[PDB]
Amino acid sequence: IIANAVVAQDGTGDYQTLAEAVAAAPDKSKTRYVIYVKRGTYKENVEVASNKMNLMIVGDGMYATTITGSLNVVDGSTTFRSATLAAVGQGFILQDICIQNTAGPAKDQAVALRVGADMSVINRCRIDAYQDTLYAHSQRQFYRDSYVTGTVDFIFGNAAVVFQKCQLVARKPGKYQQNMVTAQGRTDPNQATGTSIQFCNIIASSDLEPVLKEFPTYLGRPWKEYSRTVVMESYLGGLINPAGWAEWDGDFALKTLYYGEFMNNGPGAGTSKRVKWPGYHVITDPAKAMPFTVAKLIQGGSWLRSTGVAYVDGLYD
Amino acid sequence: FENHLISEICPKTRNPSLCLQALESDPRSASKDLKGLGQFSIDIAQASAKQTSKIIASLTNQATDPKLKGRYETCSENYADAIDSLGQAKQFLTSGDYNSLNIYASAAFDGAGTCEDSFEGPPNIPTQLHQADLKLEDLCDIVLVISNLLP
After folding, report:
1. Are A97 and A64 in contact (CB under 8 A)?
2. Membrane-spanning regions, if any (chain B)?
3. Do B114 and A139 lie within an 8 Å CB cutoff?
4. Which of A66, A170, A225, B44 is the most buried (most CB within 10 A)?
């Protein structure tokens, strides 16, 4: 397959900026339309609206093509509108590209990527910020072979979302901060949403590794009352606090959240000193892990197979 | 007899009183099966979202403070997405895709919640909008409950 539109800074493409290519893309396309973004750093805030369906934005590699911005809550943006790139168009695919927000930890919430696009795939991407890096807002999403890095609540929202074979990398935050890989925001138990992390690497960056004892990292904290997160068949580095999970605000959500761990490995995977919250579960029964697979949580096959991306449908690698 | 299905739906929602009021507003309530109650409930939720979109536009049109306007614009974008998602929810219910119905009703619900989350600290949310968010949430919850009861 060849690209339908090319973005490049050296004049060799169809457009100089990503925003222009997205605007010129067809509305309600019944087939995949591909925008290729050549190597370079593109300082823009891009939006892929609901009418821009089945759009694939693909770069020259996750180290080579970068979309960057620095909107943030401290400077007066909402979290929702702080995203460097935001996509809600059904069937969105993002690949071989970096989305970053360079605001830094002192600017509080500053989103790199926001996704509210159903049946979306993020493949071989690098998503880079600090607090609130990845706003997996809503709808069904699949992240594969990607790098997501941040500090406080760096994967947050209320998508039905599976991360598979991603490296989730906690980095050195600001003074006195505590890292949280997830802040899952399911408000209502009738919602079939949640975050599932499977066959992933949850590790420390080189700047966090020397100072693990100063800056703790937890798997998650319950942003909302029915927070629902499971980490399974994954490697957990020593950065992961023995307690595993952190309070949001005292005893808020501790009985109604559902946080699970199933068959993890690595120096941070031991569960004997985990929180004793009623809502926390060491899962040993595979039938209790199954709801968090691609097949059950995001109905993935019905739409993943036509993307070409690799996925594991069930529990085991 | 009251539609027995109402006794399975309303108690599972976060606002049973509102659920009852909404379902009883159907003159033909007793003739409706779960799918019928579902379509009615999506229609109610979408109409509320549409009205609130206009409320937000009106609040914006009298605002000059950039931070407040940014909060309203976020609310506006979220309601636009919620309206779109509820529109698609109807087709999913018709097709019997109850998994997609739940996901899209969940997304719509979260449009109102994202508006709510955007008003943390000053400038504070207008009471009118706070109530309209909670209403969309309550209405979308009727849809979510029905989506889980369907086979």
Report:
1. no
2. none
3. no
4. A170
CA-based nearest distance B61→chain A, Å: 19
Q: What residue spans define the domains of chain B?
A: 1-151
Q: Which residue of A has its CA nearest to B144?
A: A190
Helix (H, G, I), strand (E, B) or coil at B13: coil
Asked if A190 reaches chain B (Cβ–Cβ under 8 Å), the answer is: yes
B60: tokens are 């914006």
Residue matched to tokens 């004049």: A11
Residue A81 near chain B (CB below 8 Å): yes
Q: Closest Cα partner for A116 from A141, A93, A144?
A: A141
Neighbours of A78 (CB within 10 A): 25
The domain B1-151 is classified under which CATH number: 1.10.3720.10, 1.10.10.10, 1.20.140.40, 3.40.50.1000? 1.20.140.40
HSE-CB for A222 with a 13 A CA cutoff = 24
Alpha carbons A261 and A190: distance in angstroms, whole number: 22
Q: How many CB atoms lie within 10 A of CB A104?
A: 16
Cα gap A241→A247, rounded to integer Å: 13
Distance of alpha carbon A30 from alpha carbon A24, whole angstroms: 16
* Residue A178's CATH number: 2.160.20.10
Q: Cα separations (Å) of A86 from A22, A94, A145, A305?
A: 12, 11, 20, 24
A297 CB-near residues (< 8 Å, 6+ apart):
A160, A161, A162, A192, A194, A196, A291
A42 with B33: CB under 8 angstroms? no
Residue type, A255: K
**CA-based radius of gyration for chain B:** 16
Q: What is the resolution of this structure in A?
A: 1.9
> CA-to-CA distance for A198 and A235, rounded, in angstroms?
9
Give, in order, the Cα–Cα distances in Å from A219 to each of A120, A169, A242, B28, B65: 24, 11, 10, 50, 38
Q: Report long-range pairs for B38-41 (Cβ below 8 Å, ≥24 apart).
A: B38/B93, B38/B101, B38/B143, B38/B146, B38/B147, B38/B150, B39/B90, B39/B93, B39/B94, B41/B139, B41/B142, B41/B143, B41/B146
CB A181 within 8 Å of CB A154: yes
Asked if residues B72 and B81 have their Cβ atoms less than 8 Å apart, the reply is: no
Q: How many domains in chain A?
A: 1
